[PDB]
Design a protein around this nucleic acid. Structure first.
Lengths: 31, 115, 175, 135, 188, 76
RNA sequence: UCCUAAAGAGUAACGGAGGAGUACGAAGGUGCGCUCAGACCGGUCGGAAAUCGGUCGCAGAGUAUAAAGGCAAAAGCGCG
RNA sequence: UUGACGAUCAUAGAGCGUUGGAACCACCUGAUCCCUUCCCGAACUCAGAAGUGAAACGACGCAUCGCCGAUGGUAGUGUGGGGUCUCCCCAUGUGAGAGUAGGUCAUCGUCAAGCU
């Protein structure tokens, strides 16, 4: 349908977008 | 399976009410490759006319389209008139009367066979 | 992303590993119904519209708020009141959601929060709840209210619970 | 005494007491038994007179089973009351015996100790009972 | 162990009760594996000697129907409930090969001195008897010896503990169960 | 405390037994909710009252799975 | 409505037990879809028991209203 | 070799075990286009195979559970007469239920389609 409202334009955004917003583009584990 | 017995659970209503009224039944069976159609006499155990894709003079390799099923309902409207059959009923057999099912049953009304 | 990581790398990797005989025994991940909300102080029903707009925004789909069948567990609902959420995620956008969790949701927890107190059920499914923040794919962390928590109930296509463990062990569940 | 805990109804018909006893006539637990050879009905205070007779003539051991259980309530109108105003209140409870039914069983004793112990319990019951063995 | 019979060509309720008061006979049948069922009269004075015998229930008896001889095992006794005496007998032909089923007495052979009895104030409560059999008709089990002289105040004894000799099965282990047999407990 | 009060006995039953001849309005069974189901040529009215539609002979046959009782009228 | 009531209907007692003196414009019509209670194991503040996932089910649920007789073309549940 | 529609409703069921493809069948790929979801291509539907018989489905085996079930006896009962008469017995017609010996891994029909 059309009732599902998308954030998928930004779920399909930049993945390795630095360690500045996501705080990690080097590791996944916090330690 | 899961799908198969539920459309058997859906089909037993209209098939059992066509039994009580003593009507010549036009049954149908859809598959993911191709499409069958039969005309069963008024006892549920005697087949009068029957037309399929799997006859050895129609298999084009592209059966199971909506354009393939229009020819199936074409050829079954005339073997029943060759068998002398009108005044029939249409059991959709649990299939939602929308696509390849509905397009076949329009070919029956064009053929002169009337519901 | 992880779908085609699964299809090309993991899908032959697990076949000899569990000494499987064909393609079709190799287990898949099917859906995420996930949860949300128990019914904390929903005699007055107006907190749902906050909790709807919570999970509506961080998933992409819409809640289907669940009513009560016959309630006794803490309360007498006079059943038929809004109590649940239940957002189901499926194939083309289930791998897309799964990459938020455990890749960039690990920094938003702090104190390892993977498989650290859980185990499976007998049929090969994994269920887990959260209360802390997860990663949001759009910036939505200061929404100031009473944060109700939720679960991440997952269903596989396994047979036993050992094959649930090797399922997405490449996705590195912390142990 | 012996009576049900909760009953689905309060009062009951009279009926009759017919037939022999084909189930209930075989000794199952004990090795000696006191089976009844005349039809009647036992009123649940006779059972405790007959039970407390057997349990003091043993004094040592043995195991006792009580095969029969009263479940049939029986009414009785009070005195100085004309007939036909309802139905009287339940005063006591009754079991219904018919020839062949086994009443008491005993095991773990001598036969000649037990034969002279069922003599004591038979003098409290209004039926003609007998002595039987386990086969 | 031997009986001798007759033919009984009179079937009903009326003719079957006149046998018991006039002549003193007892009806019976012989039904088996190979042949038809055949009815039979026996005396109430004879069966009385066999039913008084101990192991005669789990044992082969030779029957003389006419001058006809057959090895016959007995599996039924319909018995008059009020007075107590034998009514029709209902026994069985014995084929050399078809398995068989009967019931077997127990004895509890050594319980004079038991550790549960001599050391602690003891009791021995025989719950079961007449345990069945599933044998081959060539070699018969007359009885089964059980020995509860041995271990404990406070143990029950199952069917798994006692042993059926020379390769004889027990039906209760063929079903998914194991009945308790005897107990040792404290007296009141 | 006091209890008389019975009702007045509706006269239920089964008319028209195994070999009868019928008409078109005969009733054949009052009923109390489907002891007998509608067989071949019978009606099943409002309060589950069976009735005939064609003429012939009553059958009372047991058929099918669930073992239900089918009252059919045979043109014989 | 059940029992007395004797396997067709009927049938008494100041004989044993219970209920009514109404609701509904959808709780009606019709087409299209869909299955219960409970058991259990996993799961955030509930927690013996709410919602969710799962296996086992085989009517033990439900039926506007008493009990009896029924109900998979479901006579039960949802939508146009 | 299968597929549809029946006949008969367990001696036809459940459980266990084995086994079948490229014809059928099922899973499968993608939803652009029909069409659908009180959220979701799960279900419904459309265009379609590759791939696979794993699952499912059919066949083939096992009586382990279930289900059928004799013969004999026994209970009860119509009419006639009895007796020690709140219960039974005799003459005569009728005759279960439970249990026992044992049985059962169904039997057919109509077409399309595989020696056929």
């Amino acid at each position: 349908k059309a009732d599902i409202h998308p954030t998928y334009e930004a779920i399909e955004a930049t993945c390795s977008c630095g360690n500045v917003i996501k705080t990690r583009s080097t590791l996944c584990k916090p330690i | 399976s899961v799908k198969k017995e539920t459309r058997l659970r859906r089909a037993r209503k209209a098939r059992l009410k066509m039994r009580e009224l003593e009507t010549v039944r036009l049954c149908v069976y859809r598959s993911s490759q191709h499409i069958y159609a039969q005309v069963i006499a008024a006892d549920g155990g005697k087949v009068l006319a029957s037309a399929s894709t799997l006859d050895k003079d129609l298999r084009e390799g592209a059966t199971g389209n909506i354009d393939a099923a229009k020819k199936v309902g074409q050829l079954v409207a005339e073997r029943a008139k060759a068998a002398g059959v009108t005044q029939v009923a249409f059991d959709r057999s649990g299939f939602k009367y929308h696509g390849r099912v509905k397009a076949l049953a329009d070919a029956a009304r064009e053929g002169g066979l009337e519901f | 992303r992880l779908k085609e990581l699964y299809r090309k790398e993991i899908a032959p990797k697990l076949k000899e590993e569990l000494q499987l005989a064909n393609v079709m025994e190799v287990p898949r991940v099917t859906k995420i119904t996930l949860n949300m909300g128990l019914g904390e102080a929903v005699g007055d029903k107006k907190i749902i519209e906050n909790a709807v707009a919570d999970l509506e925004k961080i998933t992409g789909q819409k809640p289907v708020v669940t009513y009560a069948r016959k309630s006794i567990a803490g309360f007498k609902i006079r059943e038929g009141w809004p109590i649940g959420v239940k957002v189901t995620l499926r194939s083309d956008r289930m791998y897309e959601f799964l990459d938020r969790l455990l890749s960039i949701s690990l920094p938003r927890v702090r104190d390892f929060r993977g498989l650290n107190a859980k185990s499976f059920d007998g049929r090969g499914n994994y269920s887990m709840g959260v209360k802390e923040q997860i990663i949001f794919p759009e910036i939505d962390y200061d929404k100031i209210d009473a944060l109700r928590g939720l679960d991440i109930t997952l269903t596989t296509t396994a047979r036993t619970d050992d094959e649930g463990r090797a399922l997405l062990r490449a996705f590195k569940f912390p142990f | 005494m012996l009576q049900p805990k909760r009953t689905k109804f309060r009062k009951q018909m009279t009926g009759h007491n017919r037939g022999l006893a084909h189930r209930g006539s075989k000794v199952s637990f004990g090795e000696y038994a006191l089976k009844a050879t005349s039809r009647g009905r036992l009123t649940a205070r006779q059972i405790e007179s007959a039970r407390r007779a057997l349990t003091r003539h043993v004094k040592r051991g043995g195991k006792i089973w009580i095969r029969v259980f009263p479940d049939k309530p029986v009414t009785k109108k009070p005195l100085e009351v004309r007939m036909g105003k309802g139905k009287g209140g339940v005063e006591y409870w009754v079991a219904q015996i018919q020839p062949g039914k086994v009443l008491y069983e005993i095991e773990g004793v001598s036969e000649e100790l037990a034969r002279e112990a069922f003599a004591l319990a038979a003098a409290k019951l209004p039926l003609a009972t007998s002595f039987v063995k386990r086969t | 162990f031997i009986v001798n019979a007759q033919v009984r060509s009179d079937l009903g309720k009326g003719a079957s009760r006149r046998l018991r008061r006039n002549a003193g006979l007892v009806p019976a049948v012989v039904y088996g594996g190979d042949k038809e069922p055949q009815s039979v009269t026996l005396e109430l004075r004879e069966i009385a000697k066999l039913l008084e015998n101990e192991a005669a229930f789990s044992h082969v008896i030779a029957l003389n129907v006419g001058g006809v001889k057959e090895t016959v095992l007995i599996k039924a006794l319909q018995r008059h409930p009020a007075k107590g005496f034998v009514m029709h007998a209902d026994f069985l032909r014995v084929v050399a090969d078809h398995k068989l089923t009967a019931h077997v007495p127990l004895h509890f052979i050594n319980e004079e001195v038991a550790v549960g009895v001599k050391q602690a104030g003891g009791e021995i409560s025989h719950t079961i008897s007449e345990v069945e059999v599933s044998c081959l008709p060539k070699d018969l089990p007359e009885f089964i010896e059980v020995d509860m002289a041995k271990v404990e105040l406070g143990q029950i004894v199952h069917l798994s503990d006692l042993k059926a000799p020379k390769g004889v099965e027990l039906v209760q282990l063929a079903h998914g169960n194991d009945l308790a047999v005897a107990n040792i407990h404290a007296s009141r | 405390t006091r209890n008389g009060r019975d009702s007045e006995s509706k006269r239920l039953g089964v008319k028209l037994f195994g070999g009868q001849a019928v008409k078109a309005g005969n009733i054949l069974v009052r009923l109390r909710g489907t002891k007998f189901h509608a067989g071949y040529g019978v009606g099943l009215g409002k309060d589950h009252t069976l009735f005939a539609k064609v003429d012939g002979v009553v059958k009372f046959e047991t058929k099918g799975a669930f073992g239900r009782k089918y009252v059919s009228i045979v043109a014989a």
